[PDB]
Design a binder for these strands. Structure first.
Lengths: 82, 85, 129, 205, 123, 80
RNA sequence: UAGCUAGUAGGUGGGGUAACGGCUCACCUAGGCGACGAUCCCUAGCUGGUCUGAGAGGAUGACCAGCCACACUGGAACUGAGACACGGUCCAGACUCCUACGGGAGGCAGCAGUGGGGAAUAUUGCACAAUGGGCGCAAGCCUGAUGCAGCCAUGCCGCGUGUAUGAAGAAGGCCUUCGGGUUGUAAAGUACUUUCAGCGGGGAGGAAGGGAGUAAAGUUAAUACCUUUGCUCAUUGACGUUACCCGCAGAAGAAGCACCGGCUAACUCCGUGCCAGCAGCCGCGGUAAUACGGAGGGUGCAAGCGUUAAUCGGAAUUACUGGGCGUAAAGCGCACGCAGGCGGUUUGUUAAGUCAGAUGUGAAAUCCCCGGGCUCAACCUGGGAACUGCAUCUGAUACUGGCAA
């Protein structure tokens, strides 16, 4: 199974999640096929907080990739524009 | 060691016994075939080949011989009989 | 034996400038006339003249600006022992641009300015400073 | 992490007024400046080349109140920025928040300005900044909070702001007690006597 | 020097081995100080230099200088050898860390106090 | 097309096979001198047409023995 | 360390594997590798990278990430999509343990933790709230991964130990040509400020989902059930007396370490007298020692500072960039010559080197640039550049090479 999932990369008490496409049996912050966006749960209240490449996500779900609950929640957040 | 590894130990023993029996019957049928090719017998070996074909295809489908091996056998043995007949 | 006639040419010009020689003769070839045409074009020699029929002889009328000599230091870069082939980005400037470096590019024998403008590197023959 | 000692001693080893006690009175008058930085201070040093470079770096740090690892980091940042490393280094020292509070006349010295900055009496852009080395960007408004406004110090400090030269790259205005750092100070806009090539060459050995 | 000669056989600078075989190149080692001596120096100097001879923890039997005025070492006295040559004595390559395992700090010392194992006097 | 190499036969005497030396001409990483450098390859040929001292083109295929992952396409320049 | 190799090198045929293959066997051939360094010996996990360097290089490969190998030691397979399997099986061995003496049991190089070894390196913590994994339709269960907390100045970064005024230039210390000088605006005095620590209140964010009701659509015989989308209702935080904000009292709780002969910033007095001792090199000390030990004074760094170990630099002292060889080290005693390196001159062809462009790749992080978020910084992060390479295709043909004359 390949999974589009989050991978924790920020500092302590300040996570920055990068949404990647990994073979699901790798580690979380390990090996991935391609990274496809990010998700900062803070970032500030400025402009984005999250961008996420929907074309490549649709490509991988076309291939057979699964999606975790957060990535599904983010696609349900950034629906097409908002 | 104290787990569900005990269950995998006993299951792998049980399946070892089952697979050993089926693997042994398969090998005896193939020995029938190219032990009939050891003598110059065409129709005897064809009868043995027809006797081994469903069991080798079947053990390929059941999952213990991994069908390419299945194919090899019959391929090799077909060659032997049309080396002979 | 003679194994680098280009460095021999540049030796003739260094030792002609160093001896206040008016003109310098040598055996001639296509590459020496190409280099000599670059040197006349860039102003380091006064003129050249190839004579002879069966044994051509290149002759360089040298320059002297004041009492001093114009060709301050001519060096051979891509010698036969070790040849030096630079790209259009690696292509050096000599005396911070005040002194050309004769590069043999596929389009012909040019300077460093002319071949960096032409967009193509090559085999860097000599530094004239 | 900061100096905490005799100040006019530091101003007396350098031979030059480092503006370390600006305060109430005029030019020193009780310093014995030039005369004796210690017991053998009456001796002329006959200073070396390392001594002049070192002593220039110490002049600048002892002016702006910076220690060595922090100064050295300013030299690395001034080196990597595009342009002139001496001028970039003074631009990094002049954008310090305690310095900008000193230039606006909110503190009498840079240590008093550093205590105003330190004791949460100073906002930049409407946010309180507690940090002496905050790097004030151009077109910023740095002001005093409602607490520690109309305290004596800052008033007196603005009183002695008019005795100095009114820096060109600021909007000093003391009515509202707010200031605007407008642009980066040009090298020709500050002090004229520090030799920053000596500290470039000091760190580049 | 000719580039062909370097293709055939490249340049090679030697290894420049260590002055201090305190093995593994460890900062300190500990030893047992098999004996304690005083030893006369080389020619331009004259003194009696207080020097121990030590069986280290890695097997090596090395001799080691004892810094400062007066020590309390005697023959078993497990010390912490340091590394650092005393040039004036032929063949000592090490020092003892004063203020370490069984090597007391130098008595009645006030300056350069950290390098002799002496605590700050309360005043 | 296919990627192929050219080289010369260095020895001959093996039972439907050959061995070919390849001359790559590579710059030294430190010294900047272009140096010749060989690559001997065990190469297969059905019916062993090429003899010693030839020049032959050569492509890569599946393994045919130990080393031997190379097979000729065209024998050129056999001249003795 | 100059010879190594008999399943060895190749062939034919049989077998074997998921798959090519001496992978294996029978037969045939007598090869194969090697001075472009085989074989043997010593050492070593490899890489992205890290440290140093102007660079080229040199050293290294802790954390983080990719690959490999190992799981007490030696071997073997079984189950399985996948293992010749860290917390599986079997055998053997060493050790440790139980025993009724017949036999049994175990494997921290998982996380904590012990004993030992060592100059040296941490808690037998909290939680699955987040992210991820396994199982499950799901709820949920498990997770020493992970999130966090504890200890440690081990590093990097930030802040603090106040601020202004203050000459009677106080006393005391040290020096003094006994005039004074210096410590020194230093302290005390006076006037202000409360960062952080202490005390008391307030209080984000990491929380998205999940559960229970509806409404609509889809499916359907069905307005059931299920799925999806909206809406409503209670809820879900280990960290955590959180970050942060406000109020309180008072300068109140908060400065050492090395050095001062030259190199190398910073000097005198006293004690000692080739001693005691110092020292990185030069070297100090045998009676007035700016070098030893103390004091006063100063200098440098600063919650650090020194010493030691190790690397690169300086070291152009292995020189590719970038050195030399008459006399400093260095031209074989002289030749002939194979392999090697280099090769006059003209024309044509090729285009291998060389050059130009394109494409694929050169993982992400790291370095660099322009921005963004933590009060700033360290840190985290968005986009680019870069990864100097390799392969393929398209061209150019001056130089080098191949070929022909």
């Amino acid at each position: 199974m390949v999974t589009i999932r989050l991978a924790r990369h920020g500092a302590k008490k300040r996570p920055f999640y990068q949404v990647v496409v990994a073979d699901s049996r790798n580690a979380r912050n390990g090996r991935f096929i391609e990274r496809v966006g990010f998700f900062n749960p803070i970032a500030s209240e400025k402009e984005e907080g999250t961008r996420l490449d929907l074309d490549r996500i649709a490509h991988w779900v076309g291939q057979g990739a699964t999606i975790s609950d957060r990535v599904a929640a983010l696609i349900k957040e950034v629906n097409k524009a908002a | 060691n104290i787990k569900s590894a005990k269950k995998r130990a006993i299951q792998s023993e049980k399946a070892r016994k089952h697979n050993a029996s089926r693997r042994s019957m398969m090998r005896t049928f193939i020995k029938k075939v190219y032990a009939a090719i050891e003598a110059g017998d065409k129709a005897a070996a064809q009868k043995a080949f027809n006797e081994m074909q469903p069991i080798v295809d079947r053990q390929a489908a059941k999952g213990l011989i991994h069908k390419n091996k299945a194919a090899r056998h019959k391929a090799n043995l077909t060659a032997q009989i049309n080396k002979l007949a | 034996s003679m194994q680098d006639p280009i460095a021999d040419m540049l030796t003739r010009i260094r030792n002609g400038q160093a001896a206040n020689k008016a003109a310098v003769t040598m055996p001639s070839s296509k590459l020496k006339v190409a280099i000599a045409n670059v040197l006349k074009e860039e102003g380091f020699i006064e003129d050249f003249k190839v004579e002879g029929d069966t044994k051509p002889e290149l002759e360089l009328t040298l320059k002297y600006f004041q009492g001093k000599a114009v060709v301050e230091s001519i060096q051979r870069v891509s010698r036969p022992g070790l040849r030096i082939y630079k790209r259009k980005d690696e292509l050096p400037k000599v005396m911070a641009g005040l002194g050309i470096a004769v590069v043999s590019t596929s389009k012909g024998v040019m300077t460093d300015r002319a071949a960096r403008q032409a967009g193509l590197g090559g085999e860097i023959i000599c530094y004239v400073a | 992490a900061r100096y905490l000692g005799p100040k006019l001693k530091l101003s007396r080893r350098e031979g030059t007024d480092l503006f370390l006690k600006s305060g109430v009175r005029a030019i020193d008058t009780k310093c014995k400046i030039e005369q004796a930085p210690g017991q053998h201070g009456a001796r002329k040093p006959r200073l070396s080349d390392y001594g002049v470079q070192l002593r220039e770096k110490q002049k600048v740090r002892r002016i702006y109140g910076v220690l060595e690892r922090q100064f050295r980091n300013y030299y690395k940042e001034a080196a990597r920025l595009k342009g002139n490393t001496g001028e970039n280094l003074l631009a990094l020292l002049e954008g310090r928040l305690d310095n900008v509070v000193y230039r606006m006349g909110f503190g009498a010295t840079r240590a008093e300005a550093r205590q105003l900055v330190s004791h949460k009496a100073i906002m930049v852009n409407g946010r309180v900044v507690n940090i002496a080395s905050y790097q004030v960007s151009p077109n910023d408004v740095v002001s005093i909070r409602e607490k520690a406004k109309k305290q004596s110090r800052v008033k007196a400090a603005l009183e002695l702001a008019e005795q100095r030269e009114k820096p060109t790259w600021l909007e000093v205005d003391a009515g509202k007690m707010e200031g605007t750092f407008k642009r980066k100070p040009e090298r020709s806009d500050l002090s004229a006597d520090i030799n920053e090539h000596l500290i470039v060459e000091l760190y580049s050995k | 020097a000719t580039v062909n000669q370097l293709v055939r056989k490249p340049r090679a600078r030697k290894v420049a081995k260590s002055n201090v075989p305190a093995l593994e190149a460890c900062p300190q080692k500990r030893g047992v100080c098999t004996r304690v001596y005083t030893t006369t120096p080389k020619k331009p100097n004259s003194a009696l230099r207080k020097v121990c001879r030590v069986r280290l923890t890695n097997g090596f039997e090395v001799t080691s200088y004892i810094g400062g005025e007066g020590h309390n070492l005697q023959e078993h006295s497990v010390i912490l050898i340091r590394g650092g040559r005393v040039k004036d004595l032929p063949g000592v390559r090490y020092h003892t860390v004063r203020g370490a395992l069984d090597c007391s700090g130098v008595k009645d010392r006030k300056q350069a106090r950290s390098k002799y194992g002496v605590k700050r006097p309360k005043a | 097309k296919i990627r192929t190499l050219q080289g010369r036969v260095v020895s001959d005497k093996m039972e439907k096979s050959i061995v070919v030396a390849i001359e790559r001409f590579v710059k030294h990483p430190i010294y900047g001198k272009f140096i010749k450098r060989t690559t001997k390859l065990h190469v297969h040929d059905e019916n062993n047409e090429c003899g010693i001292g030839d020049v032959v083109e050569i492509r890569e295929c599946r393994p045919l023995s130990k080393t031997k992952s190379w097979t000729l396409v065209r024998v050129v320049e056999k001249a003795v």
